[PDB]
Each structure stands twice: as structure tokens, then as C-alpha cells.
């Protein structure tokens, strides 16, 4: 008729386990830590050919919807359009620097992203 | 740094019905010695030690 | 808008430097306004 759920844990983790059981847990996108493989897959498939195409591909994910509701969860300083655009440009520049330092992509005039051989071999396998 | 000084607060052992001259002189000296302490915004709070209370 | 247009990495650094310069100019204008308000209140 019913179901018992007895969670035996420490006293420090009892309040979090009691709060995350009856209240609905919100979803938070953590794609900012593992965006290099997604950027390499977008650059190897000729989808993100520049910075604007990469920003448009990153804006269609759940991280852009989570940053507009929780700015401090995504290490942002505001919910405005300029601060979010600057954070997206900084994330795209960090992804491009991580792709160029690992010899996975090529930056024509520091903005045009071209897939290299190592990036294509990483995105293929 | 983001907040403004609204004056100062002090306690008194006796219930004073009027303003204290030494506290007003100290407030005037703090307003004259600091350019950020404007007289229109800085006030003096007196907490008279009431018996069993505080006014 | 719907599709944001990002810039180059050096262009992102230049945009961050321009935003920092605009924030410094706004802080200098606010400090000048505060000094003018203090000079008006003192006189």
C-alpha cells in the first residue's frame, strides 16, 4: 500500500537528503566543464565554422536556459544580455584556445574555426 | 564602501529629555573632520537606559 | 537576440578591455558627481 525509504547517513548530510526528497530538485546544466568535445564535434562537422555559429550552437542548449534563471550557478555576474554575451564569448574563446593549444583546430584571423587532423581524429573515434 | 554613513549611535545611563551637548559637539566634530559625513544625512541616536527597557 | 554573434579571442579580450574602460569611465563620472554633490552640500 505504501513504500518506506529509510536513508541512514551522517548528521551533516541529513538536511540535504531531507530537502532533496520532498521538494523538487532543479536541473543545472554543467556543460561549461566539458564543452571542448562538443566544440570539436561542432567544428569537425562544419557546424560551428566561426564564433557566431559556435555561440548560436551553444545558445540552443540547456546551459543558455539555465544561465538566464541562475546566473551565479554558471559563474556569471548578471542576467543581462551584455554580461551573458561576454560570458559566452569568454567561454568560446577558452574553448578555441583549448582546441588550438592541443593542435585540434585552426584559427584563421583568430575567429574562423577550421577542423584539423587531430580534432577530426578525436571527433571521429 | 557601497553604504553611506547615516550618523552614529551611543548609549546614555540617564533618560535625557533634550539633546546632549557633548554628543552634538562630537557629531559636529565628526561632520567637520570627515567630508563624507554630511549634516543632512548623519544623525545621532541616543539609547537612554530605561529601567527594564531602552528608549 | 535568438542567435548571438560572438567574436574572436583577441576581439573578446579587446571587448573586455573596452567594457572595463567604460566601467572605469562610469566610476570616474560617478566620483565626479559625488564630489560635486559634496561641494554643493558643503557650501
From Swiss-Prot, chain A:
Widely expressed. It is found in: Nucleus. Changing residue 39 to L: In a colorectal cancer sample; somatic mutation. The modification Phosphothreonine is found at residue 68. Contains two helicase domains. The N-terminal helicase domain has catalytic activity by itself, contrary to the C-terminal helicase domain that may have a regulatory role and enhance the activity of the first helicase domain. It is linked to Retinitis pigmentosa 33: A retinal dystrophy belonging to the group of pigmentary retinopathies. Retinitis pigmentosa is characterized by retinal pigment deposits visible on fundus examination and primary loss of rod photoreceptor cells followed by secondary loss of cone photoreceptors. Patients typically have night vision blindness and loss of midperipheral visual field. As their condition progresses, they lose their far peripheral visual field and eventually central vision as well. Component of a core complex containing at least PRPF8, SNRNP200, EFTUD2 and SNRNP40. Component of the U5 snRNP and U4/U6-U5 tri-snRNP complexes, building blocks of the spliceosome. Component of the U4/U6-U5 tri-snRNP complex composed of the U4, U6 and U5 snRNAs and at least PRPF3, PRPF4, PRPF6, PRPF8, PRPF31, SNRNP200, TXNL4A, SNRNP40, DDX23, CD2BP2, PPIH, SNU13, EFTUD2, SART1 and USP39. Component of precatalytic, catalytic and postcatalytic spliceosomal complexes. Component of the minor spliceosome, which splices U12-type introns. This is U5 small nuclear ribonucleoprotein 200 kDa helicase. It comes from Homo sapiens (Human). The lineage of its organism: Eukaryota, Metazoa, Chordata, Craniata, Vertebrata. The chain holds residues 1698 to 1822 of 2136 of the full protein.
Curated annotation (Swiss-Prot), chain B:
Widely expressed. Disulfide bonds: none annotated. It is found in: Nucleus; Nucleus speckle. Coiled coil: none annotated. It comes from the Eukaryota. Plays a role in pre-mRNA splicing as core component of precatalytic, catalytic and postcatalytic spliceosomal complexes, both of the predominant U2-type spliceosome and the minor U12-type spliceosome. Functions as a scaffold that mediates the ordered assembly of spliceosomal proteins and snRNAs. Required for the assembly of the U4/U6-U5 tri-snRNP complex, a building block of the spliceosome. Functions as a scaffold that positions spliceosomal U2, U5 and U6 snRNAs at splice sites on pre-mRNA substrates, so that splicing can occur. Interacts with both the 5' and the 3' splice site. Part of the U5 snRNP complex. Component of the U4/U6-U5 tri-snRNP complex composed of the U4, U6 and U5 snRNAs and at least PRPF3, PRPF4, PRPF6, PRPF8, PRPF31, SNRNP200, TXNL4A, SNRNP40, DDX23, CD2BP2, PPIH, SNU13, EFTUD2, SART1 and USP39. Component of the U5.U4atac/U6atac snRNP complexes in U12-dependent spliceosomes. Within the minor spliceosome, which acts on U12-type introns, interacts with PPIL2 and RBM48. Core component of U2-type precatalytic, catalytic and postcatalytic spliceosomal complexes. Found in a mRNA splicing-dependent exon junction complex (EJC) with SRRM1. The MPN (JAB/Mov34) domain mediates interaction with TSSC4 and SNRNP200. Has structural similarity with deubiquitinating enzymes, but lacks the residues that would bind the catalytic metal ion. Contains a region with structural similarity to reverse transcriptase, presenting the classical thumb, fingers and palm architecture, but lacks enzyme activity, since the essential metal-binding residues are not conserved. The chain holds residues 2170 to 2224 of 2335 of the full protein.
Swiss-Prot record, chain C:
In vitro phosphorylated by CLK1 and U1 snRNP-associated protein kinase. Phosphorylated by SRPK2 and this phosphorylation is required for its association with the tri-snRNP (U4/U6-U5 tri-small nuclear ribonucleoproteins) and subsequent spliceosomal B complex formation. May be phosphorylated by SRPK2 on Ser residues in the SR domain; the phosphorylation is required for the removal of inappropriate R-loops during transcription. This is Probable ATP-dependent RNA helicase DDX23. Involved in pre-mRNA splicing and its phosphorylated form (by SRPK2) is required for spliceosomal B complex formation. Independently of its spliceosome formation function, required for the suppression of incorrect R-loops formed during transcription; R-loops are composed of a DNA:RNA hybrid and the associated non-template single-stranded DNA. Belongs to the DEAD box helicase family. DDX23/PRP28 subfamily. The phosphorylated form (by SRPK2) is a component of the U4/U6-U5 tri-snRNP complex composed of the U4, U6 and U5 snRNAs and at least PRPF3, PRPF4, PRPF6, PRPF8, PRPF31, SNRNP200, TXNL4A, WDR57, SNRNP40, DDX23, CD2BP2, PPIH, SNU13, EFTUD2, SART1 and USP39. Identified in the spliceosome C complex. Interacts with ERBB4. Interacts with ERCC6. It is found in: Nucleus; Chromosome. The chain holds residues 158 to 200 of 820 of the full protein. It comes from Homo sapiens. It comes from the Eukaryota.
Amino acid at each position: 500500500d505504501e513504500g518506506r525509504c529509510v536513508i541512514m547517513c551522517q548528521g551533516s548530510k541529513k538536511d540535504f537528503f531531507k530537502k532533496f526528497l520532498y521538494e523538487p530538485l532543479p536541473v543545472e546544466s554543467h556543460l561549461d566543464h566539458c564543452m571542448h568535445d562538443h566544440f570539436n564535434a561542432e567544428i569537425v562537422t562544419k557546424t560551428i565554422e566561426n564564433k557566431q555559429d559556435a555561440v548560436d550552437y551553444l545558445t540552443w542548449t540547456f546551459l543558455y536556459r539555465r544561465m538566464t534563471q541562475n546566473p551565479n550557478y554558471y559563474n556569471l555576474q548578471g542576467i543581462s544580455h551584455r554580461h551573458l554575451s561576454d560570458h559566452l564569448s569568454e567561454l568560446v574563446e577558452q574553448t578555441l584556445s583549448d582546441l588550438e593549444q592541443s593542435k585540434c583546430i585552426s584559427i584563421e584571423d583568430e575567429m574562423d574555426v577550421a577542423p584539423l587532423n587531430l580534432g577530426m581524429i578525436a571527433a571521429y573515434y | 564602501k557601497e553604504m553611506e554613513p547615516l550618523g552614529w549611535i551611543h548609549t546614555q545611563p540617564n533618560e535625557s529629555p533634550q539633546l546632549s551637548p557633548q554628543d552634538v559637539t562630537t557629531h559636529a566634530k565628526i561632520m567637520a573632520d570627515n567630508p563624507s559625513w554630511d549634516g543632512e544625512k548623519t544623525i545621532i541616536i541616543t539609547c537612554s537606559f530605561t529601567p527594564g527597557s531602552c528608549t | 537576440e535568438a542567435k548571438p554573434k560572438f567574436l574572436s579571442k583577441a576581439e573578446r579580450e579587446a571587448e573586455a578591455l573596452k567594457r572595463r574602460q567604460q566601467e572605469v569611465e562610469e566610476r570616474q563620472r560617478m566620483l565626479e558627481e559625488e564630489r560635486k554633490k559634496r561641494k554643493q552640500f558643503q557650501d
